[PDB]
Design an enzyme around this catalytic site. Sequence first.
Site, PDB file in Angstrom:
ATOM      1  N   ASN A 287      29.968  35.593  38.213  1.00  6.55           N
ATOM      2  CA  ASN A 287      30.405  36.901  38.734  1.00  6.55           C
ATOM      3  C   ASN A 287      29.679  37.350  40.004  1.00  6.55           C
ATOM      4  O   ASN A 287      28.453  37.557  40.014  1.00  6.55           O
ATOM      5  CB  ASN A 287      30.349  37.905  37.561  1.00  6.55           C
ATOM      6  CG  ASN A 287      31.207  37.436  36.397  1.00  6.55           C
ATOM      7  OD1 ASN A 287      32.358  37.906  36.223  1.00  6.55           O
ATOM      8  ND2 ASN A 287      30.648  36.511  35.605  1.00  6.55           N
TER       9      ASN A 287
ATOM     10  N   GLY B 254      29.154  44.137  36.874  1.00  9.15           N
ATOM     11  CA  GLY B 254      29.228  45.526  36.410  1.00  9.15           C
ATOM     12  C   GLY B 254      27.855  46.183  36.654  1.00  9.15           C
ATOM     13  O   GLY B 254      26.842  45.482  36.756  1.00  9.15           O
TER      14      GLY B 254
ATOM     15  N   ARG C 204      25.889  37.129  38.847  1.00 11.76           N
ATOM     16  CA  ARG C 204      25.569  36.867  37.442  1.00 11.76           C
ATOM     17  C   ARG C 204      26.405  35.757  36.801  1.00 11.76           C
ATOM     18  O   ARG C 204      27.624  35.735  36.864  1.00 11.76           O
ATOM     19  CB  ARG C 204      25.733  38.168  36.606  1.00 11.76           C
ATOM     20  CG  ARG C 204      24.685  38.336  35.541  1.00 11.76           C
ATOM     21  CD  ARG C 204      24.956  39.324  34.492  1.00 11.76           C
ATOM     22  NE  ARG C 204      26.110  39.040  33.676  1.00 11.76           N
ATOM     23  CZ  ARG C 204      27.338  39.530  33.826  1.00 11.76           C
ATOM     24  NH1 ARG C 204      27.671  40.414  34.751  1.00 11.76           N
ATOM     25  NH2 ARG C 204      28.267  39.059  32.976  1.00 11.76           N
TER      26      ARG C 204
ATOM     27  N   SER D 138      35.645  40.950  32.484  1.00 10.77           N
ATOM     28  CA  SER D 138      35.540  41.892  31.388  1.00 10.77           C
ATOM     29  C   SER D 138      36.318  41.449  30.143  1.00 10.77           C
ATOM     30  O   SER D 138      36.886  42.276  29.384  1.00 10.77           O
ATOM     31  CB  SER D 138      35.928  43.300  31.764  1.00 10.77           C
ATOM     32  OG  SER D 138      35.566  43.742  33.039  1.00 10.77           O
TER      33      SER D 138
ATOM     34  N   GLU E 212      40.274  45.887  35.625  1.00 11.62           N
ATOM     35  CA  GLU E 212      38.877  46.252  35.568  1.00 11.62           C
ATOM     36  C   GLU E 212      38.493  47.511  36.328  1.00 11.62           C
ATOM     37  O   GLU E 212      37.304  47.867  36.405  1.00 11.62           O
ATOM     38  CB  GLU E 212      37.986  45.114  36.093  1.00 11.62           C
ATOM     39  CG  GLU E 212      37.778  43.904  35.207  1.00 11.62           C
ATOM     40  CD  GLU E 212      36.888  42.794  35.629  1.00 11.62           C
ATOM     41  OE1 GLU E 212      35.692  42.992  35.301  1.00 11.62           O
ATOM     42  OE2 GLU E 212      37.234  41.773  36.241  1.00 11.62           O
TER      43      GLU E 212
ATOM     44  N   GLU F  31      31.255  30.877  33.281  1.00 13.83           N
ATOM     45  CA  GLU F  31      31.798  31.402  34.541  1.00 13.83           C
ATOM     46  C   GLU F  31      30.706  32.068  35.369  1.00 13.83           C
ATOM     47  O   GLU F  31      29.546  32.096  34.938  1.00 13.83           O
ATOM     48  CB  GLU F  31      32.779  32.535  34.186  1.00 13.83           C
ATOM     49  CG  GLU F  31      32.164  33.806  33.578  1.00 13.83           C
ATOM     50  CD  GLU F  31      32.752  35.082  34.100  1.00 13.83           C
ATOM     51  OE1 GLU F  31      33.089  34.964  35.295  1.00 13.83           O
ATOM     52  OE2 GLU F  31      32.886  36.125  33.505  1.00 13.83           O
TER      53      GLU F  31
ATOM     54  N   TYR G  11      31.759  47.242  26.589  1.00 13.45           N
ATOM     55  CA  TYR G  11      31.709  48.633  27.042  1.00 13.45           C
ATOM     56  C   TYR G  11      31.768  49.732  26.019  1.00 13.45           C
ATOM     57  O   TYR G  11      31.070  50.748  26.254  1.00 13.45           O
ATOM     58  CB  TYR G  11      32.811  48.926  28.108  1.00 13.45           C
ATOM     59  CG  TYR G  11      32.843  47.852  29.167  1.00 13.45           C
ATOM     60  CD1 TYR G  11      31.761  47.639  30.021  1.00 13.45           C
ATOM     61  CD2 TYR G  11      33.972  47.041  29.298  1.00 13.45           C
ATOM     62  CE1 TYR G  11      31.813  46.628  30.981  1.00 13.45           C
ATOM     63  CE2 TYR G  11      34.028  46.041  30.266  1.00 13.45           C
ATOM     64  CZ  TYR G  11      32.949  45.831  31.096  1.00 13.45           C
ATOM     65  OH  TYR G  11      33.033  44.822  32.036  1.00 13.45           O
TER      66      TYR G  11
ATOM     67  N   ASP H 121      27.233  33.543  33.236  1.00  8.80           N
ATOM     68  CA  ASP H 121      27.345  33.532  31.778  1.00  8.80           C
ATOM     69  C   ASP H 121      27.361  32.043  31.375  1.00  8.80           C
ATOM     70  O   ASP H 121      28.106  31.218  31.899  1.00  8.80           O
ATOM     71  CB  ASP H 121      28.549  34.223  31.190  1.00  8.80           C
ATOM     72  CG  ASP H 121      28.908  35.513  31.870  1.00  8.80           C
ATOM     73  OD1 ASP H 121      28.030  36.214  32.402  1.00  8.80           O
ATOM     74  OD2 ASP H 121      30.124  35.776  31.854  1.00  8.80           O
TER      75      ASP H 121
HETATM   76  N1  LIG Z   1      33.728  28.176  25.117  1.00  8.57           N
HETATM   77  C1  LIG Z   1      33.541  29.332  24.518  1.00  8.57           C
HETATM   78  N2  LIG Z   1      33.303  29.365  23.203  1.00  8.57           N
HETATM   79  C2  LIG Z   1      33.118  30.536  22.607  1.00  8.57           C
HETATM   80  N3  LIG Z   1      33.149  31.764  23.132  1.00  8.57           N
HETATM   81  C3  LIG Z   1      33.384  31.693  24.444  1.00  8.57           C
HETATM   82  C4  LIG Z   1      33.589  30.557  25.195  1.00  8.57           C
HETATM   83  N4  LIG Z   1      33.806  30.882  26.516  1.00  8.57           N
HETATM   84  C5  LIG Z   1      33.728  32.184  26.532  1.00  8.57           C
HETATM   85  N5  LIG Z   1      33.487  32.748  25.308  1.00  8.57           N
HETATM   86  C6  LIG Z   1      33.354  34.187  25.049  1.00  8.57           C
HETATM   87  O1  LIG Z   1      34.236  34.832  26.019  1.00  8.57           O
HETATM   88  C7  LIG Z   1      33.538  35.814  26.781  1.00  8.57           C
HETATM   89  C8  LIG Z   1      34.218  35.939  28.165  1.00  8.57           C
HETATM   90  O2  LIG Z   1      34.013  34.651  28.723  1.00  8.57           O
HETATM   91  P1  LIG Z   1      33.906  34.524  30.316  1.00  8.57           P
HETATM   92  O3  LIG Z   1      34.304  33.127  30.636  1.00  8.57           O
HETATM   93  O4  LIG Z   1      32.607  34.971  30.851  1.00  8.57           O
HETATM   94  O5  LIG Z   1      34.984  35.550  30.875  1.00  8.57           O
HETATM   95  P2  LIG Z   1      35.078  36.925  31.591  1.00  8.57           P
HETATM   96  O6  LIG Z   1      35.593  36.853  32.979  1.00  8.57           O
HETATM   97  O7  LIG Z   1      35.950  37.779  30.743  1.00  8.57           O
HETATM   98  O8  LIG Z   1      33.759  37.543  31.752  1.00  8.57           O
HETATM   99  C9  LIG Z   1      32.111  35.235  26.855  1.00  8.57           C
HETATM  100  O9  LIG Z   1      31.125  36.259  27.143  1.00  8.57           O
HETATM  101  C10 LIG Z   1      31.938  34.654  25.456  1.00  8.57           C
HETATM  102  O10 LIG Z   1      31.748  35.902  24.693  1.00  8.57           O
HETATM  103  C1  LIG Z   2      28.875  43.810  30.159  1.00  6.21           C
HETATM  104  C2  LIG Z   2      29.578  42.680  30.905  1.00  6.21           C
HETATM  105  C3  LIG Z   2      29.404  42.661  32.405  1.00  6.21           C
HETATM  106  O1  LIG Z   2      30.710  42.746  32.987  1.00  6.21           O
HETATM  107  P1  LIG Z   2      31.091  41.908  34.203  1.00  6.21           P
HETATM  108  O2  LIG Z   2      30.169  41.851  35.294  1.00  6.21           O
HETATM  109  O3  LIG Z   2      31.129  40.416  33.702  1.00  6.21           O
HETATM  110  P2  LIG Z   2      32.198  39.656  32.839  1.00  6.21           P
HETATM  111  O4  LIG Z   2      33.330  39.405  33.878  1.00  6.21           O
HETATM  112  O5  LIG Z   2      31.788  38.492  32.053  1.00  6.21           O
HETATM  113  O6  LIG Z   2      32.673  40.757  31.864  1.00  6.21           O
HETATM  114  C4  LIG Z   2      32.500  42.348  34.680  1.00  6.21           C
HETATM  115  C5  LIG Z   2      32.496  43.737  35.288  1.00  6.21           C
HETATM  116  N1  LIG Z   2      33.426  41.496  35.374  1.00  6.21           N
HETATM  117  C6  LIG Z   2      28.627  43.887  32.829  1.00  6.21           C
HETATM  118  O7  LIG Z   2      29.184  44.909  33.265  1.00  6.21           O
HETATM  119  O8  LIG Z   2      27.381  43.793  32.724  1.00  6.21           O
HETATM  120 MG   LIG Z   3      34.203  35.317  38.284  1.00 12.49          MG
HETATM  121 MG   LIG Z   4      33.997  37.486  34.638  1.00 10.90          MG
HETATM  122 MG   LIG Z   5      31.582  36.794  31.079  1.00 15.60          MG
END
Ligand SMILES: Nc1ncnc2c1ncn2[C@@H]1O[C@H](COP(=O)(O)OP(=O)(O)O)[C@@H](O)[C@H]1O
Ligand SMILES: CC[C@@H](O[P@@](=O)(OP(=O)(O)O)[C@@H](C)N)C(=O)O
Ligand SMILES: [Mg+2]
Ligand SMILES: [Mg+2]
Ligand SMILES: [Mg+2]
Length: 306
Positions: free
Chosen positions: A272, A276, A255, A150, A15, A270, A216, A257
Amino acid sequence: MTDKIAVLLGGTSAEREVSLNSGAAVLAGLREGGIDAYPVDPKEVDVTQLKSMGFQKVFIALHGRGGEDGTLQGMLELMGLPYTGSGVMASALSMDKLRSKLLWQGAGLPVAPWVALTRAEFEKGLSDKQLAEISALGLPVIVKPSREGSSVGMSKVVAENALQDALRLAFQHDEEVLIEKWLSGPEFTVAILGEEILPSIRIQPSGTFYDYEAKYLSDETQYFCPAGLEASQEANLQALVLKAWTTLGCKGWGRIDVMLDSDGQFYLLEANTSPGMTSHSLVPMAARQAGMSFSQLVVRILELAD
Ligand SMILES: Nc1ncnc2c1ncn2[C@@H]1O[C@H](COP(=O)(O)OP(=O)(O)O)[C@@H](O)[C@H]1O
Ligand SMILES: CC[C@@H](O[P@@](=O)(OP(=O)(O)O)[C@@H](C)N)C(=O)O
Ligand SMILES: [Mg+2]
Ligand SMILES: [Mg+2]
Ligand SMILES: [Mg+2]
């Protein structure tokens, strides 16, 4: 001045380029705000002599292992330098999608059904009976690296036959991976600032999932703030976001999600602790809506530095 601020950008995560983009923006932001800020790339400068350099405060504009887990924070704390977000424990907890999940589920938070795998269980031949686990989850399932951000190493697997590979990948980024149920509902993210929570943002990627490119390098990605959600469900969001957040121990800024399921419910994906801050990032969007500018946010974030 005197109060020489350090914005830790880049580092060595996956990242790092996003990191570098955040730093560049927070650097500007802090400078518009009237702070003496500095680009301190841990991938050059030993962050250990950060104390020796005359920094009085530190802005964690870093994402991922090395910068978002409890590692750096531990240092900073022993040095005697304040930093901008979540303490040592809430940084290590948040970075582990696997442990963040058990704690949330521990407290009865609406978490998506998963199935953890380690790399060692992986290079052995997961029980042809461990698929009984995974296939009782439905189709599809999204396979993800435990400690990534990301959307790295993530791979949607529709069909059992597409998993082995989904796992090789996720696995090239971590030794503990979470395989979870695919959530069929809009995608949300909520941003915390101090103890306040910024308007909700509903993401609508023009692909399959909010993949790396979508986050991005894509202009198709639609951003709705607030969610344009009814004042019932909207209330349920904040409520859940703050719960899942205090349960984590996080502070200052962060933040979460979440996504909707066919069940009508919210599923914490998850969290954060060093979000970002690029020209595509979510926090920044949540704030502008809350009528703040980028230097007010970044600066308010520093006001919380402890
Ligand atoms: N259970 C799920 N079902 C469908 N899509 C999912 C699910 N979990 C995550 N995603 C998709 O994967 C993306 C990354 O998930 P997340 O757990 O936030 O990981 P990251 O650390 O990459 O941000 C989410 O923003 C969503 O778009
Ligand atoms: C556009 C996605 C978000 O990125 P992150 O904060 O969250 P994510 O892990 O779900 O992607 C990222 C920099 N780790 C951000 O920059 O706003
Ligand atoms: Mg995290
Ligand atoms: Mg994350
Ligand atoms: Mg996410």
